[model samples]
Target: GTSSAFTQIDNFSHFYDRGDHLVNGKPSFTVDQVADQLTRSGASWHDLNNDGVINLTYTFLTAPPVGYASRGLGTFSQFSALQKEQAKLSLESWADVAKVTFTEGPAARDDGHMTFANFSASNGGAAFAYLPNSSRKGESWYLINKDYQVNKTPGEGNYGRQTLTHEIGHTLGLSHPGDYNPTYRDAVYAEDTRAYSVMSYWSEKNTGQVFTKTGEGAYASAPLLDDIAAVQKLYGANLETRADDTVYGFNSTADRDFYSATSSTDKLIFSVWDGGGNDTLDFSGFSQNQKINLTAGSFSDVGGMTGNVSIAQGVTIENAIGGSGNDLLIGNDAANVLKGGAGNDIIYGGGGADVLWGGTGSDTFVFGAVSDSTPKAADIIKDFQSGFDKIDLTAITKLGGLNFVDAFTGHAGDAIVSYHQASNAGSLQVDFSGQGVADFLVTTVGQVATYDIVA
Candidate 1:
């Protein structure tokens, strides 16, 4: 008839009382076991009762309710109306079996570094939190590390998000499904692997700051199927059964109405800030259909995704900060800004009027020289830094896999960019088909670092 009301506090002992961070002891559950249960719950459609046939029922409890603490900075405060709305949207995307509550607390730092603000765990401070059970007696709380809170901020650089939604998974008794574990094995079960589980310890660079599986877009935001079954076993699965169905049920009370259906078609959303430094991000695992929103800051490493992907919206990527690495940008179809960080970088303008720059690298400008065939639209814009590398216009049309753009238009000054091969013997044959203009630039830069791209 009723479920536990989750409670949370900022104090270390209080938080710990609400949750614990163990993998094999009492109140401890492995990530694999949890994932398997989630899969089963999503696939089942039968009733638990044999009377005739009915769907099962389910419910979830939140330790820290909304408005109890700080929503973003990790302090005790209420969630902004926008975040509250996002929680609702995310919960709905999960298909009626998950709920999320923004809390005011320290974030978990999995990296073990205390460089970011409020990153207490990294610098010898307690950055863990917990989740309490319904009994308000048994060991109900789960703890999370602080490495999970460090995030790239637009202007402030790296600032830890105080109320991390990811860490909260542990508070709900979730553990790191160590998918990234070096020695992962099916029998060992030492690490976790529920790709979309919020409790996963994936880095933002690898998973794009969002929890996504290999294919599906929308995901269960909380209490993945594995989590659901654990709670069911503890509280009794019959607590969620309906009149006609047994296996069919929703795990979170937020979605009791449509408890029969399972599986969600939602895309996980993640954001990143150009934390004032040259950076490169890779988005290889995401589907081409998946959309990403980026807000770039000064001197940040911008491009990292591999193939030509489509974007839903255009995000600003600035190179206000100067760094040594020659930045590379692979723009999506959606309108986006690609600003070159400080250093010699080969600007490969892809889709949209994407801005290009030699930024500060002994930069080299390269292109296929062919235009209009693909009608590829991009801009090399003005202020293209030169004096670092020389642009070999004759080698322009030679670009192959680098055919995404053509016509290396110089804006700053004449760049001294040039091309080179391994020892002038290895495979100096410029192949724009697979290798890119930047690849050549990187090769030449390694030999001579003083040349800047002025074109």
Candidate 2:
């Protein structure tokens, strides 16, 4: 039951039984449990077609068959063109990560085109869909109730968008993780929330977080972290989504709902799965004190929401940009370029040879471990104001005992702060091993004073 995909862990116990990195706070189900519980194994398009690249057709139904309305389907009608474009957006969200491709048209034969329709007054809350069934191909449909107001719903970021995306998750072989529908929360598990799977009817309240309303602000524009693992288990991961240079947030090039935020009031939500790229997470619109974590399987508090954004496991996002608040930007082990746009920010370029930019308003750069800025591969501070900014090696100082020194004369835990006035360059060099040379180095753009350097 221990698949390699779910075996990732961090210093915290949150990584235990990873069904794609503990969403919200923790998960009740293991990796296989969520993957096996939330999806029908044999109902994926790629699995049924026996190909990694699948071409599936969908239709906007004018009316249901003769007896479906009588059989609790309510009143069936064709979807509006606007809603159809919304559907296309939802389908593109899936295709942006998975190997499946969808086209808008009726089926040539009886292959059972994925159908979209609206119900005047339905039994369900907002929307529902059927999994891929070969024998019951006639039943492959995505249904929405107009009375629920999700159809042509105010496009308030979620509503029809989340509804369409959630329904397509069902069509792609996923289901609700627990024994509950919308308006009912029977047998609700911890991971049974939109924070984990887009298929969830419940909010993140199931897991220990504040709940957002359904058909409202900031929904998953694509699959959640667990949903990505579930779909990838069935159809395999797509390698061509954003394998090039992609920048998410602020000046986002993704052009998707989850990735683009036009205003500071716009709430952003979704998990990322980049194949390979010099990618970035730029959240420069909001003025709230935010925390952006670029590590895989980690959560970030953005746009006045808790744990609304995440980076999927095995995905290395290369950079992050914070907004005009006291933000905290945490980087992964990759060579990251972290930019604190404004406010008194804390930039922790956690492993790798990273580049840090404390934009303005008395910022601080922190180093927790020796490997964070080693001698062989040191980090760089591009905009460190001499008197305004601070360099916190306090964590390393607490480790082996750090002392500020005029020169490194082979003393363990001896730190030196030197500035070359002619070149306008500063260096915070440390001798953790006391080898008379620098075991750690942090180069900066301006002067670094002894008072500004914290041991």
Candidate 3:
């Protein structure tokens, strides 16, 4: 299948067509032919009988066919116990969502519906399975490439259970959701759309990128909604209910931690109980346009998030409290309130109307452009400690290079900065001349001599 083919351009073309199958001693199978097959067969390309129920009996082969072992096939016993279990789990995942049942039968039995074998496709592909109702139906077998490291963990840099699950998807007659041609490849669908489907060539589409459900080391462990719908179209849906809250913990001795929440409707919370190390609370995976809060926990360690943390785009962070350690809190392209409890922290209110509160230690307020194209918002510094904390205008080109005295000319009793009207809608400007385009008022009552600019 296209999934197992070599990533090279020519190899990909041949694999996409004939799927590792040789035609006239050369690879063949046109893109249009595959597309026609997919379209004609409905969502799941393999529902040939139109029965909606995929009933099959499978067996683990004791030995490879003649010349197969030389081609990289390994005996069933050669696979580790964990590998075997993971494979079964992958198969069960399909059954869990569809009206499919896989019964175990003895090897070499004439009635054997399907067979599992570890084989090498000469590194041309990872694995391949014959579709149902095909010429090779009862006699066909699913082959796992011996060269690929098959495991369950995502960070292991190996083909995990997801690979097996994907192969099973092919066996059940699923095809890649995107077009086979590289030029016609669907970037939105591959990158942001239906990339979650087990049936899609996700590994190929997201090459070199790390995939995680949470910001931590976790990956999506189940079939996505698209895969479920595709399978359920042939088989019925599994009506199992699951837990709502997903919790994560950090190491007591480790100094850093990574976390995330990707689902739009997911109600997520983070807990940092250990009090010794500096940590990071990462919400980069959370959805955009929603409200979020990073509340302080019982331990002082919860405030030790000193690393750069990102909220989703257009998200409004209601509150983010820091600890004794210097932290960096970054907001998205929306209004936010960032409060540093007791630490000398850096707060970046990205692109939206933000309120920055440096509670105790000397802090820095950062303002700049966001991933979204909207103009940066005018941030209000609630606690501006003269001669104590600092302000970073490095992202704002207009004020980044100016001296403290040159940037802010005294306006009345308050310090003021001015910029052109066309420049970011007065986000970074201070009124220099009374006739200036836009102006930003530094709402502070302290002496101007105590304030300093960090170019």
Candidate 4:
């Protein structure tokens, strides 16, 4: 038998032998092997000792590193406050998948820390981190790209939590999925089309890609199966599997709720029924361009997660039933059905042909242009309540570049209202006749001021 334990593939000699470390004839060391090696030996590639309870402390640098400040990179405090939270969340995500635990060390002493810095395009822009090794044995550090805007936006590409998660993957004794062998990259792409692992370069650019199992739900922030398996091979298993599907039903007089979907299938439906009280539905986890149905059981008080919620390109639909109390409903770039059952409600039908109904209390309906190559679709406002309810054309004006004065110039009686385009090239016609009416025509800006308010 060959006693060859290490196989160097890349020129970079950073940590974990920079290649393949064999254990029992396997390319990578198992969790038991890694733990045993670290404890018995001084330092090795897998450097987490203390059995399964691996602890690492970290700190955040207050200022940017050299060459970073000159490049218009802001200090830690200059960035959005959410960046810190997102970074922490990224670490927590890794902890959720593996058995390891992380904590913030004292400002003076730290095992690992994070810093924001600007790097040339030559060095990967998003972020980078170091792995465990003999020289920097128990210490790890992360450098965030100052040029990139670190945010929680799903498909923003340049900056997001996934970038931090990828860098963190290195500190956990994991390498880029295909870094060992360039040939394996194609195999990884074949197995996971989206490259859902946190330890993959493809995942950094494709932020929305999620780790998934055949019968399991998709995990947005957490590590995927391959990641979990790899990390566990180094740090043992956490023994807790994330839920594939979840539901929240409120049956009380008043309730405050938060719900997130865990399924990866586009056909999956995350149903939320708020029996009573104000509720918040967080659909940030389900960013794969799918349909969502939310039911307001009795009272309203509904809030939704925002920031580029659009997913797949197909006709995704979101149906909301606001029952009773004052409700607020927001939609995305897909056909939506919004109904404010009672109480004053505000509904923003974001893009796409939508069906809006103001059930009772004075209601507000908002419309905008659909974000697709296809032409805009006319929305159907079931109950206009001209005397009480109002239609907001602010978003529409921004989309079609029409003035308020021209939007309402020609109300086609009980049929439709015509608004001409400002450039004198096109027009939009809004039909106010009744429900189920889908078609309308737009010729110019004569009916801009037709609405109740300029906004």
Candidate 5:
């Protein structure tokens, strides 16, 4: 492997010659003892000692290191809260172990760097083994990226924990298990077919349903069999396999509750962190007939594993108070009422006769066909900055004003307008023009829709 593939296994017991080392960082037992337990529990391993004895070594890697107490405010403890929480969660995800501490260093470096002998990321890359100019043989280590790591202070997201778990796998010498042709592993399981790997990318999904911490789910985010085999060969397979369960096929709400309660950890693993910073609202997952209402707290910033924040629905003035960041707001499906709080927000009205009310900011109203084949009518109201907004009229085909009643309501910044002009019981059509940015007022009278720039 390359230099990136090597790491030092810190905080582990010395078992270089005897081939006896701890599995999940417990210094109490030998590698053979852990291997025996795994074998009895149906896990497999290769015999390296051949003397009918599987010896092991374990070194204690304490969290926060020794003599490294918090220095309080104005010190390096800002991201500590998030870091410890993530560390606890990462340690608890292991199969055979509960937790392992990081090793301390005698030398001072750039960051308050910790040392470890046997820490690995989810993909089996160890930081300990990769440390430069270390003579410690058979050791592994893992280090998190400085940017993704969180300190004691309260930031939006808790991504450091996700990265800790990922790095721990590397300490064990496991590689990225997806389709690496050199080793030739089988296709990843169907349950592991998500776009972002827990070991790699972090994207958005609702709650921690996919990445639950306490659950009966396997390491769906880790290496495949070949990767597992590699670790087994090196560390002598003190491995325990976790099985997969159905995600959405609960018999009842009670069952769903019970499953979630029992599987809380897995739920955390299954969660998707928000990865975008757009202030625009886009609606999704709705049929053409339903409508949704977005009051004050309907949309706000949801924390991510990284710095990225997810856009969640509900009503909130915070969402209206947008900053300079590129904001993406979405209302998935249903007749969504989108209110842009502030900033240059991109708003999308998913389905139904949606209403978009832009608060006090320069915003863009995005429009597109829902499905490529079965296209439906799009109707919406666009709120502008200069006390005026545009009402889309492309969906109204009738030529008479008798059958339609359109209303515009709100003050200068807070504004909204809605139209009910369907000839049949279907939805109305709203058209979007590619013009740059302007405050234009639109209304319908006697079947003639009128548009005028705010005077």
Candidate 6:
């Protein structure tokens, strides 16, 4: 599927394209080359063994006698109980989105088996892993530094778990999109950072997108947007994770760290990939101006950050709840429920039947397409206070310079603004077709007049 969210994603072969691969005098590829030099499918997924499903056995173990016959790779420490729990959480993150499954098995480093071991080393990086078909013949070994990786918990967006997730990407036949390494390098393109994929070593700031990390949570406990896209391309997406109606952000029912936020102090830097049932992006605990977009693959700027929150490439969020700041909440082409809680919000339901509420402060409701609010599926604006709230119909070019009329007179752009004193309610209807009929109708409250509209 084409990327409908960011125009930049369409310019590249895939979201996994690397900027350094586009650099001169090196492994230079055209701007749109798939930098992960694995077996490329029609799309951008890299197949480890050209298999639809890959299953393996993994174990959390410790040091063994030198020349250990069963679990080779010398003496090393096992993961701490906390570290092992994080390891399982890390694997669960991958399995939640892709066709990779793991089971606890004997600590044998053989083909189709994975093992994790920790050692004390300041290797300048967090951890490293073996590829699918390395000299071990399809065995994946993760050797982590005990001091660096084990002690680093999910709190504070630990580099240990984040880096371990990246290493898991490598073992599964993915590569860094760019040349930035343990020894850093300047990002040569815009999408070369953790904002796009967890595989990159570069920061999202290098790509010109600035945001606070997911403080208090695992920075990226799961595969990111491009990362999810890349893996699903390889093994296909897993549609079994959180298929029920899910809520993310403050009041989130998603027990996963990547999707939950307990406080305004808990910053976010992750993407969501739900299975099916309707989902909501509930960022209702912050006082900062947020721009929440419900379209798939789109990024939202929230809590004093940009590109920190994103929806997965194939996921659709159906609702949004904003907090006490002037915010812009946008909905996709689906029937959405948008709630702007106590803020001067500008809400636009792009298409489909939508229900909007400008809860408290002055708000502006926008209609960009004629189909956005139709007679068959008119958008309901629950609390559109007059004099304070506005209806922006300027984008509907058919309504040429609206003239608020007492009643429809078959004149193009003649808008009918009516209020019932008995019920204390009103509606803003426009006859853009000049047919004496309301081409666009928005159910509202309070007295609506020409001064309250921008046509």
lDDT of 5 by residue, 163-218 (tens): 45555444433333243333112322221122223432322232122322243323
By TM-score, rank the candidates, best first: 2, 6, 3, 4, 1, 5
lDDT of each: 0.29, 0.74, 0.43, 0.41, 0.29, 0.70
Off by over 4 Å in 2: 1-27, 30-33, 40-42, 46-51, 66-72, 109-112, 138-147, 154-156, 181-188, 210-218, 399-401
- Write down the worst ten-residue block by lDDT for model 4: 2-11
Q: Which stretches of candidate 3 lie above 4 Å from their native place? A: 1-54, 65-79, 107-112, 121-124, 138-147, 150-158, 179-194, 202-219, 240-455
**lDDT by residue (tens digit), candidate 4, 374-450:** 12465666655545666554443332332322334343222234433554332334433323232333222123224
Error of 5 at 38 (Å): 23
- Per-candidate Cα RMSD to the true structure, in Å, reads 20.6, 5.5, 15.3, 20.9, 20.8, 6.1
Q: Which numbered prediction scores highest in lDDT against the true structure?
A: 2
What are the per-residue Cα lDDT tens digits for candidate 3 across 344-433?
A: 666666555666777787777654432212223456666666577665543433433443334444442123343333432222244333
Question: Against the hidden reference, what TM-scores do the models get?
Answer: 0.31, 0.87, 0.39, 0.37, 0.31, 0.82
Query: Residue 28 deviation, candidate 5, in Å?
Result: 46
Candidate 1 Cα misplacement greater than 4 A, ranges: 1-167, 170-183, 187-198, 201-324, 366-378, 385-396, 399-455
TM-score of 6: 0.82
lDDT of 1 by residue, 401-441 (tens): 12222333332211222333554311112223342232222
Predicted structure 5: lDDT: 0.29
Itemize residue pairs with steric clashes in candidate 3. 4-125, 215-260, 417-429, 417-430, 417-431, 418-430
Candidate 1 residue 327 C-alpha distance from true site, Å: 2.6
Full-model lDDT, candidate 6:
0.70
| lDDT (10s digit) by residue, model 6, range 1-455 | 21122222122113333445543224433222433332232232233455666676786655543554444333466767877787777788888888888677873432266767664445423466666657442233444544444444543366666766777777676767754435335544456567777877666766556665444333566778778877776678899888999999888887887677888866787888899898899998988988888878777877777778888867888999998988888888999999999878888887888989999998888777778898777888877777888887766753357777888999887877788899877777878789998888877656777788776
Give candidate 1's whole-model lDDT.
0.29
